[PDB]
């Protein structure tokens with residue numbers, strides 16, 4: 001599924017991401033925009049053989065099992081394919097674990113490089129939330 005901007009914001013709000021660990025909703029929508037262009041099916045392969053999955057580009061070396069990342073830790077206890085569903089619940093639940101692990105949203109390179117320190121509230125502007 002390719003979400004709309006406000007569609008994703010409301011789905012993320014419903015799943016408790018607004019202000020989760022202090023990150024307002026605009027941060028999550030901005031991260032998903034630049035990580036995956038709001039596409040739940042986005043996958044990108046990394047040089048280390050790990051792969052990023054889904055709307056928040058969650059990585060197979062640490063967070064999900066994709067059967068082909070040796071030394072994966074599967075800390076979200078899910079197959080990476082679950083992260084590609086049109087239901088974002090598994091992505092959201094795993095992202096909460098990621099953002100809680102010490103480094104906040106700096107775990108998402110696109111958030112660090114393209115959302116952090118910008119007016120992330122612009123990403124939910126005009127949405128019925």
Ligand SMILES: [Cl-]
Pocket residue numbers: 024025026027120121122124
């Ligand atoms: Cl915001």
Ligand SMILES: [Cl-]
Pocket residue numbers: 109110113114
């Ligand atoms: Cl980037």
